[PDB]
Amino acid sequence: ISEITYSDGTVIASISRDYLYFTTLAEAQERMYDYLAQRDNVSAKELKNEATQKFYRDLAAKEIENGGYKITTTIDQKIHSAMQSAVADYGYLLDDGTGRVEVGNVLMDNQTGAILGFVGGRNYQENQNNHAFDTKRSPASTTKPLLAYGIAIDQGLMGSETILSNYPTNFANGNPIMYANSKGTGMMTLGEALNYSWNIPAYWTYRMLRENGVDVKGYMEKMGYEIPEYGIESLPMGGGIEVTVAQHTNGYQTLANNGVYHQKHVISKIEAADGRVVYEYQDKPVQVYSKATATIMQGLLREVLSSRVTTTFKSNLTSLNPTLANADWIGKTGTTGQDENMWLMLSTPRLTLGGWIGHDDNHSLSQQAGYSNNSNYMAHLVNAIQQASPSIWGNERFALDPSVVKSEVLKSTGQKPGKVSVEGKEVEVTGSTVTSYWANKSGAPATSYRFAIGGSDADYQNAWSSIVGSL
């Protein structure tokens, strides 16, 4: 008789009415499919044949049913059990007056990509859809650190105190770029752009990557993402990208693990009754962002949560478990256009926890669902995980890599002080300075007239007026 086990060998089931069983069995079936096709010498060409494939999929299922295989999962019994109780006990906190709210969460070890526990949904007995591994939804503004800022930093095109335009601008189709009811403001730092999740700065950042011919697909495909069209202007805001929570957790794993991707996995090994290893996970680490980039981004995402602009999470957690709230939490929120998907992705140096909520039919949630409800539910989820496994989150801090370049830059421009051409006239740009972190060799450039990411001529005239005002 075949068994699926937790990470410590405790049997989950013989080959039963929950996500854990069907998720791990589906994945073990897929690994058995690959093993049996390779064993029978069936080529990837032969496997293109629809009837041969159907047969091999059936053979795989039956082989587990009838064999005596042991399937070792990465799942930590105590932790995953605590996560189930947390959703059973506190899932109702998600209900925001837009009907029953669905949820998915994946908890992943940053150093291995192992999935220690997950939440598939509110209640498998009422709704079987698996929101952790099956349902794909736009990751909304949580795309910004990975595909816009992280890449721009990694390419030496931005530092931590770089200024970006948030002046009003339009998309290619002529529509204004919006952030709720705001058509935009003026210049702002990268930290302010992240903390608020403004949209225009991320639009400009990605425009810059396109203009510069940056291989964005290279980064994203190294983390396992599949995006059909990389020219989409709203990609940083989650346009043109749909992901599972387990996949997206893996992108935040990469940033938390100092830029080093490990592939997510729930199966570590499948053995025959006699011990023959028929499948084993093989770690293939990839340095997707430099250590400088990742560690700079960790410092920025720490402030996203502490600032409490887009999520109440740190307030909810400091109440529930003040000691755990003092662990080194970093994270990012997302909200889709009509409030159809809310995300909160969280990490400590040891673990990453992804969280989505939304409705199976894509109807809107309430305006506050992601800011407050999901934050409060995820604070309960994190507490429950720590209650189950007291050291699992860890007490380590994220810290800048030694390879980070520190540049003294003007607050106003985010570039080094120097002379600048303004309206036909050299001007000595002077004033108060801040340390800005870079991931290139030479750090920040000298200040130039177009000192910010993005902006029209009119925007710069308005901005320079204001700076020159200060000198």
Ligand X SMILES: *[B-](O)(O)[C@@H](C)NC(=O)c1ccccc1C(C)C
Q: How far apart (Å, rounded) are the C-alpha atoms in residues 466 and 471?
A: 9
Work out whether 418 is an interface residue with ligand X (CB under 6 A).
no
Work out whether 317 is an interface residue with its own copies (CB under 8 A).
yes
Work out whether 275 is an interface residue with its own copies (CB under 8 A).
no
Among left, alpha and beta (phi > 0; psi -120 to 50; other), residue 285 is: beta
Residue 308, binding choice from ligand X, Na ion, its own copies, none, Cβ under 5 to 8 Å by partner class = its own copies
Q: How far apart (Å, rounded) are the C-alpha atoms in residues 244 and 136?
A: 5
Site for its own copies in 380-399 (CB under 8 A): 380
Judging by DSSP bridges, how do beta strands 3-5 and 11-14 pair with one another? antiparallel
| Furthest C-alpha separation in the chain | 83
Work out whether 181 is an interface residue with ligand X (CB under 6 A).
no
Residue 320, binding choice from Cl ion, Na ion, its own copies, none, Cβ under 5 to 8 Å by partner class = its own copies
CA distances from 368 to 216, 309, 360, 375 (A): 32, 12, 19, 10
Question: Residues of 135-159 as b/e, b for ≥16 C-beta within 10 angstroms?
Answer: bebbbbbbbbbbbbbbbbbbbbbbb
Sole binder of ligand X in the list 64, 237, 388, 463 (CB under 6 A): 237
Sole binder of Na ion in the list 310, 321, 374, 413 (CB under 5 A): 310
Residue 224 annotated as lining a ligand binding site: yes
Q: Are 131 and 121 in contact (CB under 8 A)?
A: yes
Work out whether 110 is an interface residue with Na ion (CB under 5 A).
no
Residue 226 annotated as lining a ligand binding site: yes
Residue 96, binding choice from Na ion, ligand X, its own copies, none, Cβ under 5 to 8 Å by partner class = none
Work out whether 122 is an interface residue with its own copies (CB under 8 A).
no
Work out whether 434 is an interface residue with its own copies (CB under 8 A).
no
- Residues in contact with 206: Cβ distance below 8 Å, sequence separation at least 6, in sequence order: 147, 148, 216, 233, 235, 236
Q: Are 291 and 403 in contact (CB under 8 A)?
A: yes
Sole binder of ligand X in the list 63, 76, 161, 339 (CB under 6 A): 339
Q: Which one-letter amino acid corresponds to residue 96?
A: D
Which tokens is 341 given? Answer: 């998907």
- The residue ranges that bind ligand X (CB under 6 A) are 140-141, 179-180, 197, 199, 237, 334-335, 337, 339
Q: Which residues bind Cl ion (CB under 5 A)?
A: 6-8, 18-20, 22-23, 27, 76-77, 130, 171, 175, 216-217, 225-226, 230-231, 243, 247, 265-267, 272-274, 290-291, 306, 308, 312, 314-315, 359-361
Residues that bind its own copies in the complex, under the rule CB under 8 A:
93, 308, 312, 315-320, 322, 372, 375-376, 379-380
